Amino acid sequence: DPDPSQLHRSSLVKNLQNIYFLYEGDPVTHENVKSVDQLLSHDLIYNVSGPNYDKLKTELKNQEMATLFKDKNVDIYGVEYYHLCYLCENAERSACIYGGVTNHAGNHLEIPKKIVVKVSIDGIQSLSFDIETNKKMVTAQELDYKVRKYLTDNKQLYTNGPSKYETGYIKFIPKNKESFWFDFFPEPEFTQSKYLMIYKDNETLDSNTSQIEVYLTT
Ligand SMILES: [Zn+2]
């Protein structure tokens, strides 16, 4: 886990809006789609379209994980970035993301499994809110997003400017697997590309046993 000194201070971030739009804006979601092309052996290009993009490239953990989902019909769910997102030169409407991929076949729930987010502020966990998905194995990225989307819009986690909280991070807790966490705030001078790499591992989770806690301080 993280120590107060391991956490990035929000008041130290330059252009924090750049995080804000990532979570304030809608995600990139797709259902039964198959890998169309590939730039580097560790990424997968999809001919999926969306507002502001007709192509999507996702960077995965490595080549192995990239060929592992290559010829499979997967579901995509992720927070994208455009600045520093290049492929060829004719594709002028592209968008990049890391991970956020999962097998489509046999990964669906007839009824959404809502997970309980334990938001603790300044040590007092006086808040609880739901978050749901239709996948049995979902990526921490799909869960992580919703968490921040909720908190942004209700607790003002982010704004088109500063943040009411000095520090903050999301902690994930797998049934029996070991835990991990993501710092809601970046380094002073960051880039969405670099920051988003917290989803490059594409670490999925069993939404039927996984737990989620959030630690925010003012
Ligand atoms: Zn699906």
mmCIF file of C-alpha atoms and ligand atoms in Angstrom:
data_model
loop_
_atom_site.group_PDB
_atom_site.id
_atom_site.type_symbol
_atom_site.label_atom_id
_atom_site.label_comp_id
_atom_site.label_asym_id
_atom_site.label_seq_id
_atom_site.Cartn_x
_atom_site.Cartn_y
_atom_site.Cartn_z
ATOM 1 C CA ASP A 1 0.000 0.000 0.000
ATOM 2 C CA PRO A 2 0.820 3.774 -0.165
ATOM 3 C CA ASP A 3 2.328 6.106 2.454
ATOM 4 C CA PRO A 4 1.476 9.836 2.726
ATOM 5 C CA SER A 5 4.868 10.517 1.117
ATOM 6 C CA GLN A 6 4.212 8.084 -1.725
ATOM 7 C CA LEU A 7 1.134 10.064 -2.720
ATOM 8 C CA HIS A 8 1.220 12.887 -5.261
ATOM 9 C CA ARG A 9 -0.059 16.209 -3.950
ATOM 10 C CA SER A 10 -2.774 17.788 -6.121
ATOM 11 C CA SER A 11 -1.707 21.333 -5.391
ATOM 12 C CA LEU A 12 1.612 20.474 -7.089
ATOM 13 C CA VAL A 13 0.068 19.498 -10.440
ATOM 14 C CA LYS A 14 0.326 21.781 -13.463
ATOM 15 C CA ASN A 15 -2.726 21.690 -15.776
ATOM 16 C CA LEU A 16 -4.716 19.231 -13.644
ATOM 17 C CA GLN A 17 -7.641 19.805 -16.065
ATOM 18 C CA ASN A 18 -5.951 17.230 -18.277
ATOM 19 C CA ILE A 19 -6.881 14.503 -15.782
ATOM 20 C CA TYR A 20 -10.327 15.982 -15.238
ATOM 21 C CA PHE A 21 -11.447 15.597 -18.842
ATOM 22 C CA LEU A 22 -10.264 11.999 -18.926
ATOM 23 C CA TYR A 23 -12.735 11.040 -16.188
ATOM 24 C CA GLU A 24 -15.395 13.718 -16.721
ATOM 25 C CA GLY A 25 -15.804 12.586 -20.297
ATOM 26 C CA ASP A 26 -17.433 9.374 -21.434
ATOM 27 C CA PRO A 27 -15.305 6.233 -21.952
ATOM 28 C CA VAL A 28 -14.531 4.208 -25.072
ATOM 29 C CA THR A 29 -16.705 1.110 -25.024
ATOM 30 C CA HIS A 30 -17.229 -1.594 -27.607
ATOM 31 C CA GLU A 31 -18.797 -5.032 -27.558
ATOM 32 C CA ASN A 32 -18.193 -7.847 -30.035
ATOM 33 C CA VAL A 33 -15.226 -6.483 -32.012
ATOM 34 C CA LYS A 34 -12.115 -8.220 -33.449
ATOM 35 C CA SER A 35 -8.525 -6.968 -33.867
ATOM 36 C CA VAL A 36 -8.193 -5.427 -37.302
ATOM 37 C CA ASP A 37 -4.529 -4.400 -37.510
ATOM 38 C CA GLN A 38 -1.453 -3.837 -35.333
ATOM 39 C CA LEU A 39 1.345 -1.247 -35.187
ATOM 40 C CA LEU A 40 3.748 -2.568 -32.598
ATOM 41 C CA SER A 41 3.673 -6.203 -31.493
ATOM 42 C CA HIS A 42 2.327 -5.095 -28.087
ATOM 43 C CA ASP A 43 -0.763 -3.158 -29.251
ATOM 44 C CA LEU A 44 -3.999 -3.892 -31.115
ATOM 45 C CA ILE A 45 -5.819 -1.661 -33.552
ATOM 46 C CA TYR A 46 -9.601 -1.816 -33.870
ATOM 47 C CA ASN A 47 -11.796 -0.395 -36.648
ATOM 48 C CA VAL A 48 -14.234 0.823 -33.998
ATOM 49 C CA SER A 49 -15.540 4.359 -34.326
ATOM 50 C CA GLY A 50 -16.776 6.971 -31.870
ATOM 51 C CA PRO A 51 -17.200 10.731 -31.514
ATOM 52 C CA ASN A 52 -13.783 12.080 -32.467
ATOM 53 C CA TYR A 53 -12.381 8.750 -33.673
ATOM 54 C CA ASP A 54 -12.801 6.039 -36.346
ATOM 55 C CA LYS A 55 -9.835 4.018 -35.065
ATOM 56 C CA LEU A 56 -8.681 2.853 -31.617
ATOM 57 C CA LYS A 57 -5.275 1.526 -30.551
ATOM 58 C CA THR A 58 -4.799 -0.175 -27.226
ATOM 59 C CA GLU A 59 -1.396 -0.835 -25.692
ATOM 60 C CA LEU A 60 -1.297 -4.022 -23.656
ATOM 61 C CA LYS A 61 1.202 -5.474 -21.171
ATOM 62 C CA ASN A 62 3.337 -6.935 -23.973
ATOM 63 C CA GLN A 63 3.343 -8.884 -27.261
ATOM 64 C CA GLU A 64 2.130 -12.078 -25.602
ATOM 65 C CA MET A 65 -0.951 -10.369 -24.190
ATOM 66 C CA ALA A 66 -1.361 -8.698 -27.583
ATOM 67 C CA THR A 67 -1.444 -11.905 -29.651
ATOM 68 C CA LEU A 68 -3.536 -13.427 -26.873
ATOM 69 C CA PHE A 69 -6.449 -11.109 -27.785
ATOM 70 C CA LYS A 70 -5.475 -10.604 -31.399
ATOM 71 C CA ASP A 71 -7.884 -12.946 -33.220
ATOM 72 C CA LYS A 72 -10.470 -12.974 -30.410
ATOM 73 C CA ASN A 73 -13.793 -11.152 -30.249
ATOM 74 C CA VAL A 74 -13.172 -8.917 -27.237
ATOM 75 C CA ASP A 75 -15.018 -6.210 -25.310
ATOM 76 C CA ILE A 76 -13.294 -2.853 -25.003
ATOM 77 C CA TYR A 77 -13.650 -0.418 -22.118
ATOM 78 C CA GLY A 78 -11.153 2.398 -21.541
ATOM 79 C CA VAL A 79 -10.134 5.989 -20.914
ATOM 80 C CA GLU A 80 -8.464 7.363 -24.069
ATOM 81 C CA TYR A 81 -6.030 10.095 -24.943
ATOM 82 C CA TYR A 82 -5.251 11.814 -28.223
ATOM 83 C CA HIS A 83 -2.170 13.949 -27.601
ATOM 84 C CA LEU A 84 0.822 11.705 -28.351
ATOM 85 C CA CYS A 85 -1.417 9.135 -30.022
ATOM 86 C CA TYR A 86 0.048 8.375 -33.452
ATOM 87 C CA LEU A 87 -0.264 5.521 -35.941
ATOM 88 C CA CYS A 88 0.004 6.244 -39.678
ATOM 89 C CA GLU A 89 -0.708 9.645 -41.232
ATOM 90 C CA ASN A 90 -3.868 8.994 -43.239
ATOM 91 C CA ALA A 91 -5.804 7.901 -40.157
ATOM 92 C CA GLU A 92 -6.660 11.379 -38.875
ATOM 93 C CA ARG A 93 -9.278 10.366 -36.328
ATOM 94 C CA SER A 94 -7.512 7.968 -33.963
ATOM 95 C CA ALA A 95 -7.541 7.510 -30.196
ATOM 96 C CA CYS A 96 -5.251 5.550 -27.890
ATOM 97 C CA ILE A 97 -5.797 3.656 -24.657
ATOM 98 C CA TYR A 98 -3.899 1.032 -22.729
ATOM 99 C CA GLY A 99 -5.528 -2.263 -21.758
ATOM 100 C CA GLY A 100 -9.267 -2.296 -21.199
ATOM 101 C CA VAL A 101 -9.689 -5.510 -23.163
ATOM 102 C CA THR A 102 -11.531 -8.666 -22.126
ATOM 103 C CA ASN A 103 -12.905 -11.756 -23.876
ATOM 104 C CA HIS A 104 -16.479 -11.223 -24.995
ATOM 105 C CA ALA A 105 -17.702 -14.826 -25.178
ATOM 106 C CA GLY A 106 -18.751 -16.262 -21.822
ATOM 107 C CA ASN A 107 -18.044 -13.062 -19.884
ATOM 108 C CA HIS A 108 -21.566 -11.672 -19.592
ATOM 109 C CA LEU A 109 -24.010 -11.297 -16.751
ATOM 110 C CA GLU A 110 -27.749 -11.340 -17.456
ATOM 111 C CA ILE A 111 -27.927 -9.035 -14.420
ATOM 112 C CA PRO A 112 -25.355 -6.304 -13.543
ATOM 113 C CA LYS A 113 -23.175 -7.027 -10.491
ATOM 114 C CA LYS A 114 -22.930 -3.837 -8.528
ATOM 115 C CA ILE A 115 -19.755 -3.524 -6.492
ATOM 116 C CA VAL A 116 -19.658 -1.351 -3.358
ATOM 117 C CA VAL A 117 -17.140 1.514 -3.384
ATOM 118 C CA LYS A 118 -15.881 2.431 0.083
ATOM 119 C CA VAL A 119 -15.008 6.148 -0.103
ATOM 120 C CA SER A 120 -13.015 7.190 2.939
ATOM 121 C CA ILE A 121 -12.252 10.907 3.306
ATOM 122 C CA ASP A 122 -9.612 12.060 5.754
ATOM 123 C CA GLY A 123 -9.803 8.620 7.348
ATOM 124 C CA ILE A 124 -13.554 8.536 7.951
ATOM 125 C CA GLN A 125 -15.362 6.195 5.532
ATOM 126 C CA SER A 126 -18.717 7.926 5.920
ATOM 127 C CA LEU A 127 -19.678 7.194 2.301
ATOM 128 C CA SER A 128 -20.720 4.189 0.220
ATOM 129 C CA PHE A 129 -21.819 4.114 -3.396
ATOM 130 C CA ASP A 130 -22.521 1.434 -5.978
ATOM 131 C CA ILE A 131 -20.805 0.764 -9.305
ATOM 132 C CA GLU A 132 -21.888 -1.948 -11.743
ATOM 133 C CA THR A 133 -20.803 -4.027 -14.714
ATOM 134 C CA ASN A 134 -22.052 -6.819 -17.052
ATOM 135 C CA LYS A 135 -18.753 -8.663 -17.077
ATOM 136 C CA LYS A 136 -17.608 -11.457 -14.794
ATOM 137 C CA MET A 137 -13.948 -10.658 -15.474
ATOM 138 C CA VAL A 138 -13.708 -6.893 -15.791
ATOM 139 C CA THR A 139 -10.636 -4.676 -15.881
ATOM 140 C CA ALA A 140 -9.653 -2.552 -12.899
ATOM 141 C CA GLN A 141 -9.761 0.222 -15.505
ATOM 142 C CA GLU A 142 -13.520 -0.193 -16.094
ATOM 143 C CA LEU A 143 -14.121 -0.129 -12.355
ATOM 144 C CA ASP A 144 -11.543 2.617 -11.707
ATOM 145 C CA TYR A 145 -13.209 4.914 -14.228
ATOM 146 C CA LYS A 146 -16.756 4.700 -12.943
ATOM 147 C CA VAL A 147 -15.396 5.306 -9.453
ATOM 148 C CA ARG A 148 -13.790 8.612 -10.531
ATOM 149 C CA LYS A 149 -16.701 9.540 -12.792
ATOM 150 C CA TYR A 150 -19.045 9.249 -9.835
ATOM 151 C CA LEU A 151 -16.714 11.069 -7.465
ATOM 152 C CA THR A 152 -15.929 13.796 -9.993
ATOM 153 C CA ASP A 153 -19.595 14.586 -10.526
ATOM 154 C CA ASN A 154 -20.738 14.236 -6.924
ATOM 155 C CA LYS A 155 -17.743 14.870 -4.677
ATOM 156 C CA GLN A 156 -15.889 17.083 -7.155
ATOM 157 C CA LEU A 157 -12.888 14.761 -7.323
ATOM 158 C CA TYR A 158 -11.757 16.817 -10.317
ATOM 159 C CA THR A 159 -12.814 20.117 -11.844
ATOM 160 C CA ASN A 160 -11.742 22.084 -14.901
ATOM 161 C CA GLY A 161 -9.061 23.343 -12.549
ATOM 162 C CA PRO A 162 -7.898 22.520 -8.953
ATOM 163 C CA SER A 163 -9.051 19.728 -6.677
ATOM 164 C CA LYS A 164 -10.648 19.957 -3.244
ATOM 165 C CA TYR A 165 -8.483 17.042 -2.175
ATOM 166 C CA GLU A 166 -4.753 17.143 -1.548
ATOM 167 C CA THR A 167 -4.182 13.413 -2.103
ATOM 168 C CA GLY A 168 -6.172 10.321 -3.041
ATOM 169 C CA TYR A 169 -5.975 6.775 -4.422
ATOM 170 C CA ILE A 170 -8.175 3.800 -5.313
ATOM 171 C CA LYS A 171 -7.413 0.414 -3.726
ATOM 172 C CA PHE A 172 -8.479 -2.847 -5.335
ATOM 173 C CA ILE A 173 -8.962 -6.071 -3.392
ATOM 174 C CA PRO A 174 -9.197 -9.440 -5.244
ATOM 175 C CA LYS A 175 -10.829 -12.445 -3.563
ATOM 176 C CA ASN A 176 -7.518 -14.206 -2.998
ATOM 177 C CA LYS A 177 -5.224 -12.346 -5.372
ATOM 178 C CA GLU A 178 -2.921 -9.636 -3.952
ATOM 179 C CA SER A 179 -4.038 -5.989 -3.980
ATOM 180 C CA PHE A 180 -3.048 -2.917 -5.985
ATOM 181 C CA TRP A 181 -3.802 0.819 -6.044
ATOM 182 C CA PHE A 182 -3.715 3.878 -8.336
ATOM 183 C CA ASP A 183 -2.906 7.467 -7.366
ATOM 184 C CA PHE A 184 -5.726 9.710 -8.536
ATOM 185 C CA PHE A 185 -3.246 12.506 -9.170
ATOM 186 C CA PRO A 186 -0.129 12.571 -11.417
ATOM 187 C CA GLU A 187 3.311 14.124 -11.105
ATOM 188 C CA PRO A 188 3.529 17.947 -11.403
ATOM 189 C CA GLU A 189 4.224 17.939 -15.113
ATOM 190 C CA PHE A 190 2.619 14.868 -16.634
ATOM 191 C CA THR A 191 1.039 13.702 -19.862
ATOM 192 C CA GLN A 192 -2.199 11.707 -20.227
ATOM 193 C CA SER A 193 -0.204 9.150 -22.173
ATOM 194 C CA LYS A 194 2.306 8.573 -19.393
ATOM 195 C CA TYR A 195 -0.238 8.770 -16.586
ATOM 196 C CA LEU A 196 -2.709 6.388 -18.128
ATOM 197 C CA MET A 197 -0.080 3.647 -18.201
ATOM 198 C CA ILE A 198 -1.644 2.446 -14.925
ATOM 199 C CA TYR A 199 -4.000 0.529 -17.207
ATOM 200 C CA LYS A 200 -1.350 -0.972 -19.489
ATOM 201 C CA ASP A 201 -1.260 -4.164 -17.382
ATOM 202 C CA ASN A 202 -4.931 -4.901 -18.228
ATOM 203 C CA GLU A 203 -5.370 -6.515 -14.827
ATOM 204 C CA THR A 204 -8.945 -7.861 -14.894
ATOM 205 C CA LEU A 205 -10.894 -8.817 -11.745
ATOM 206 C CA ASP A 206 -13.664 -11.148 -10.626
ATOM 207 C CA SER A 207 -16.457 -8.615 -10.100
ATOM 208 C CA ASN A 208 -18.179 -11.144 -7.838
ATOM 209 C CA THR A 209 -15.538 -11.074 -5.101
ATOM 210 C CA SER A 210 -13.461 -7.967 -5.718
ATOM 211 C CA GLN A 211 -13.685 -4.996 -3.323
ATOM 212 C CA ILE A 212 -12.947 -1.279 -3.809
ATOM 213 C CA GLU A 213 -11.863 1.395 -1.365
ATOM 214 C CA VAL A 214 -10.980 5.032 -1.986
ATOM 215 C CA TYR A 215 -8.843 7.238 0.214
ATOM 216 C CA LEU A 216 -9.146 10.964 -0.195
ATOM 217 C CA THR A 217 -7.726 13.705 2.035
ATOM 218 C CA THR A 218 -8.268 17.466 2.057
HETATM 219 ZN ZN ZN B 1 -19.373 -8.642 -24.709
#
